């Protein structure tokens, strides 16, 4: 399976406003994806988590979602 | 907090000679500056205990340097103390 960073550009991990690329790092639900599927380093993941939370509070990223087909 | 403007102001104020950075006088000056900053931070925020431990250690280091200065040259020690208003 593909990891998120593998298929992506040279993007800002500190931009909480870019929903287009921050959406890639959320799961089918609103959960933040682990490092196994994001292909990020520890520091990169630690920054991405805070930026994702920032975007969530701004109503840009979903706090949680609903699972399908279950 | 303490930016490079205020820091360099104090250093150039307490230098034994142009270019000196780590003289006992300058060390005690910067120490006392951070001491007063923290002690004013501890006038409010009485429940900040870890910063108070840091203040204890800063007081200890300043007192050790002052003891050393008093042991080596008492006159420069008196000048420093009167200039900073301590003890």
């Amino acid at each position: 399976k593909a990891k998120v960073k593998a298929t992506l550009g040279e993007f800002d991990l500190r931009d909480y406003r870019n929903v287009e690329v921050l959406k890639r790092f959320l799961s089918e639900t609103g959960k933040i994806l682990p490092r196994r599927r994001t292909g990020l380093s520890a520091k990169e993941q630690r920054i991405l988590a805070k930026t994702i939370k920032r975007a969530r509070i701004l109503g840009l990223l979903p706090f949680t979602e609903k699972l399908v087909r279950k | 907090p303490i930016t490079k403007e205020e820091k360099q102001k104090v250093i150039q104020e307490f230098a034994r000679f142009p270019g000196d950075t780590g003289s006992t006088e300058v060390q005690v000056a910067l120490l006392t500056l951070r001491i007063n900053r923290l002690s004013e931070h501890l006038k409010v925020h009485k429940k900040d205990h870890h910063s108070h431990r840091g203040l204890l250690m800063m007081v200890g280091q300043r007192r050790r340097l002052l003891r050393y200065l008093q042991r080596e040259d008492p006159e420069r020690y008196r000048a420093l103390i009167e200039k900073l208003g301590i003890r």
């Binding site: 609903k66 699972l67 399908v68 087909r69 279950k70 | -």
Partner: protein, 116 residues
């Protein structure tokens, strides 16, 4: 006396019971059923067969209301949490979609001694 022709179906399954509430597209319920609505009384209500029978009874009451297309919502975990959906699929109601919306807190409340 409603002629709803389409709606949602919520399956609340626990380890002590399973209940199905069939509702309209804007949330108001139409019919419902459970392991106690049908004959079973005690722990028998938590068996997958009771869940199947409850889903089927609720689906037939929905037929009485005139239900054809159904969207499924699932909350909770227990025996027959899936069997309810299987019977609901083969009940004669065209299943639109199945969704698991089990409510999980963000670590807000302290659980009972059983749950720690």
């Amino acid at each position: 006396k409603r002629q709803v022709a389409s709606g949602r179906a919520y399956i609340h399954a626990s380890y002590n019971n399973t209940i199905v509430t069939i509702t309209d597209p804007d949330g108001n319920p139409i019919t419902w059923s459970s392991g106690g609505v049908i004959g079973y009384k005690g722990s028998r209500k938590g068996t997958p067969y009771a869940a199947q029978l409850a889903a089927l009874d609720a689906a037939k009451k929905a037929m009485a209301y005139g239900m054809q297309s159904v969207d499924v919502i699932v909350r909770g975990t227990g025996a027959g949490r899936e069997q309810a959906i299987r019977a609901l699929q083969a009940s004669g109601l065209q299943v639109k979609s199945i969704v698991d919306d089990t409510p999980v807190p963000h670590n807000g409340c302290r659980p009972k001694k059983k749950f720690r």
